[PDB]
Design a protein around this nucleic acid. Structure first.
Lengths: 105, 704
DNA sequence: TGGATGGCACTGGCCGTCGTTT
DNA sequence: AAACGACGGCCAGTGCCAT
């Protein structure tokens, strides 16, 4: 249910695509990043049909991240239709992640 | 003998006006003050002491006071003032000779609090005030703070613009510290015998009854101060031209390297340790993190509607959420100057570092880089571009961009005036700085030829003829090994000394250490003589400590005299020693060896004692040598200075570079230097014959 | 179980110091 | 008042360049 990415398919997967997308900018060497991956597993399951999760590894795809201005990770970006509806930085808890999604849809 | 100190309006370079001066005479036992209009009488007071065959004590006079009185007496009184070297004493010079280990003697002064931190190991007059308990204050402070209680601001170094009675009294303060410093130095019976009262003798008795080192360090200081003033003619257009070529190459290289390695994000800022999500244990090998103390999804209420639950408040724009930890990061562009970036990018490409530093980071120097190998062909080929880049930066940094680059020091007279502390190193070697003319790339390193050629007499045009000057480069041939030959003659009756003479000493050491190549032997002897461990020695022939221990024991069995010499040095200095956590803990019998001219030469470590002895002899032999050379040249009629026949430009340990008005004079300089070296050798009954080799040419690149 | 003695250029973590945002 | 944050002066860690 979680969509991978690439500097390429990113355009034709997050930008276009109708609906809401929550994109996670992570890195294999980040503690917070690896701990919020589990919480994203659950959310990617719960909120299906109301939003799709997409993870983007900033090491393998260095081109996209600079465009949005990452200042820390993991970074959660909320893409509605094709625009940056809202973004949240940090390793949110299952309960915190919800409130965020239940206030921007 | 009189003691003095003066105050002028600036550094020697731009000094124009004489403010005040104090003269404490030992005969009368009273001070005397001189104000602006007393400068004429002040200079007379100094000439009188010279007439009586007396002495004049100045702190840092050889480099400042004396030449400053020479320059100020010409533009202000239009009179010729030249204090004869033999009549001047310099406490700063004695201080540097007698207390050559102030760094250690001071640790106690630092802990107690009797010596401020900034003045740690300073020979400055003030620093001595605190050591002697004569410091009641510092002028620059009774001025800066007293400037607040007057309104006006302050401008970096302005307490000397105009004469004021407050200055005239701190001037006296500086004479009593000089006097107290002098008596503190004269009381050192190793340099000044008790049977004589030095505060009451003629200059001829002062130099002949004191330890010889006292005389040598004073002649060396006088001559080196002179060399700093001559300066080294420098070709600015060539260096600026070089900077353009190097900068363009730096850019092209930067571009190509940012194409191979790109940009990337890396932890930056984290403070606390990331804890395992399930267990809670701290995970050290993960970047540190930030745990925000504020932030949420909805802005807390403040309206009666939300002061219980009703009308929606307002969503939060803030990006953080109090509680949720994140790893702060920065986006960085590859910087080839970053050893950190180099090691990061290469490891990513499959490089597994072998050697690390005590702080944990992997070593990334020329050596290891030369051996790095990665499967990415592009990545591999980039390593040589990084090597070139680093070398380019080193050159640009030394010639143009660094705080102390040559382009920043060229004077209007087209010369670089490098300063030199004649007695800056423990062994007695001089030290160079501002800029360090003793560290200009050699003609054998990349861009070294161009760098060296920029320093040369050819860049000074004669003031009369307009013709470029010529250069004479003289070096003391194999000085270190000859000194070693003098010290083992005691155990081998000149055997090794004769080996030097016959020639090919390196072939002899090769045969005795049994090395495969003559080059391995040259690299062995210096490594061995100075302390190298068994491993570094083994690595010469491509081995380890095993081959090392056998390489040294073989050398010592075949060269008994050296073994005897080391044992002799070891037993005079060390009682016992032990290893603890990597460091050697020594207990000394004595912490100093005697030098050729009688001075105490402090020893830092046992494995380096022999090097201390040889570097010290080479240093003193060279000190006496360049002194005697200039003395013989002046005695042959040649005049020292640009307005003359020759000018000392640089002294770099075993070599000197001398500017000469004509090739003919260059030839005399070269022959004289050799005559002086033989003189030095006989003077100290040296058991090995000393020699020199000279070369004439337009600049430093040719004269070596 | 040690190359030594020195000067210096760069990068980058570690605090004060200000000004600023909840 | 508590800190978010961009800024900036130090200073230790590394390494290179001479003899």
């Amino acid at each position: 249910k979680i969509i991978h990415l690439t500097d390429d398919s990113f355009d034709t997967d997050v930008l276009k695509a109708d609906g809401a997308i929550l994109v996670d900018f992570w890195a294999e060497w980040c503690g917070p990043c690896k701990m919020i991956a589990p919480i994203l597993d659950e959310i990617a399951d719960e909120y299906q049909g109301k939003l799709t999760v997409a993870k983007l590894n900033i090491d393998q795809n260095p081109g996209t991240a600079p465009k949005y201005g990452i200042r820390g990770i993991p970074t959660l970006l909320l893409f509605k239709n094709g625009e940056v509806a809202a973004t949240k930085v940090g390793a949110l808890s299952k309960g915190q992640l919800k409130e965020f999604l239940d206030a921007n849809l | 003998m009189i003691v003095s100190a003066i105050a002028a309006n600036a550094l020697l370079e731009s000094v124009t006006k004489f403010h005040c001066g104090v003269i404490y005479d030992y005969s009368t036992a009273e001070y005397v003050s001189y104000r602006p209009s007393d400068f004429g009488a002040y200079l007379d007071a100094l000439e009188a002491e010279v007439a009586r065959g007396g002495l004049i004590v100045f702190h840092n006079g050889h480099k400042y006071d004396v030449p400053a009185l020479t320059k100020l007496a010409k533009l202000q009184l239009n009179r010729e003032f030249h204090l004869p070297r033999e009549n001047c004493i310099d406490t700063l010079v004695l201080s540097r000779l007698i207390h050559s280990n102030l760094k250690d003697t001071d640790m106690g002064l630092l802990r107690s609090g009797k010596l401020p931190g900034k003045r740690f190991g300073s020979h400055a007059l003030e620093a001595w005030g605190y050591r002697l308990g004569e410091m009641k204050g510092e002028y620059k402070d009774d001025f800066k703070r007293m400037l607040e209680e007057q309104g006006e601001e302050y401008v970096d170094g302005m307490e000397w613009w105009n004469f004021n009675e407050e200055m005239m009294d701190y001037n006296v303060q500086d004479v009593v510290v000089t006097k107290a410093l002098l008596e503190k130095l004269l009381s050192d019976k190793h340099y000044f015998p008790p049977e004589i009262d030095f505060t009451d003798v003629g200059y001829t008795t002062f130099w002949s009854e004191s330890l010889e080192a006292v005389d040598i360090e004073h002649r060396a200081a006088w001559l080196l101060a002179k060399q700093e003033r001559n300066g080294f003619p420098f070709d600015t257009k060539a260096i600026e031209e070089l900077y353009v070529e190097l900068a363009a190459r730096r850019s092209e290289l930067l571009r190509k390297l940012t194409e191979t390695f790109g940009s990337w994000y890396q932890p930056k800022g984290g403070t606390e340790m990331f804890c395992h999500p399930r267990t809670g244990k701290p995970l050290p090998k993960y970047p540190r993190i930030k745990t925000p103390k504020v932030g949420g999804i909805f802005k807390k209420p403040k309206n009666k509607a939300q002061r219980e639950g009703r009308e929606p408040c307002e969503l939060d724009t803030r990006e953080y959420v109090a509680g949720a930890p994140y790893t702060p990061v920065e986006h960085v562009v590859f910087n080839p100057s970053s050893r950190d970036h180099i090691q990061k990018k290469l490891q990513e490409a499959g490089w597994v570092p072998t050697k690390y530093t005590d702080k944990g980071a992997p070593v990334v120097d020329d050596e290891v880089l030369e051996g790095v190998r990665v499967d990415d062909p592009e990545k591999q080929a980039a390593i040589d571009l990084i090597k070139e880049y680093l070398m380019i930066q080193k050159r640009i940094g030394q010639s143009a961009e660094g705080d102390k680059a040559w382009l920043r020091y060229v004077a209007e007279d087209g010369k670089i005036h490098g300063s030199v502390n004649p007695n800056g190193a423990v062994t007695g070697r001089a030290t160079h700085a501002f800029p360090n003319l003793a560290q200009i790339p050699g003609v054998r390193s990349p861009y070294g030829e161009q760098c060296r050629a920029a320093f040369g007499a050819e860049h000074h045009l004669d003031g009369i003829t307009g013709k470029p000057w010529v250069q004479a480069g003289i070096d003391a041939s194999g000085l270190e090994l000859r000194c070693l030959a003098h010290f083992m003659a005691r155990f081998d009756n000149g055997e090794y000394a004769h080996e030097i003479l016959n020639g090919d000493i390196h072939t002899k050491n090769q045969i005795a250490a049994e090395l495969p190549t003559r080059d391995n032997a040259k690299t062995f002897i210096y490594g061995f003589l100075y302390g190298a461990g068994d491993e570094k020695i083994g690595q010469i022939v491509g081995a380890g400590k095993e081959r090392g221990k056998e390489l040294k024991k073989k050398f010592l069995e075949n060269t008994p005299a050296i073994a005897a010499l080391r044992e002799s040095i070891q037993q005079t200095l060390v009682e016992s020693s032990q290893w603890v956590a990597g460091e050697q803990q020594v207990k000394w019998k004595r912490r100093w060896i005697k030098g050729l001219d009688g001075r105490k030469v402090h020893v830092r470590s046992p494995h380096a004692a022999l090097n201390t002895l040889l570097q010290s002899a080479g240093a003193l032999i060279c000190k006496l040598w360049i002194i005697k050379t200039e003395e013989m040249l002046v005695e042959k009629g040649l005049k020292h200075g640009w307005d003359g026949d020759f000018a000392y430009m640089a002294w770099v340990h075993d070599e000197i570079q001398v500017g000469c008005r004509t090739e003919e004079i260059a030839q005399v300089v070269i022959e004289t230097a050799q005559e002086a070296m033989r003189w030095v050798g006989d003077h100290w009954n040296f058991r090995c014959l000393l020699d020199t080799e000279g070369k004439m040419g337009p600049n430093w690149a040719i004269c070596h």
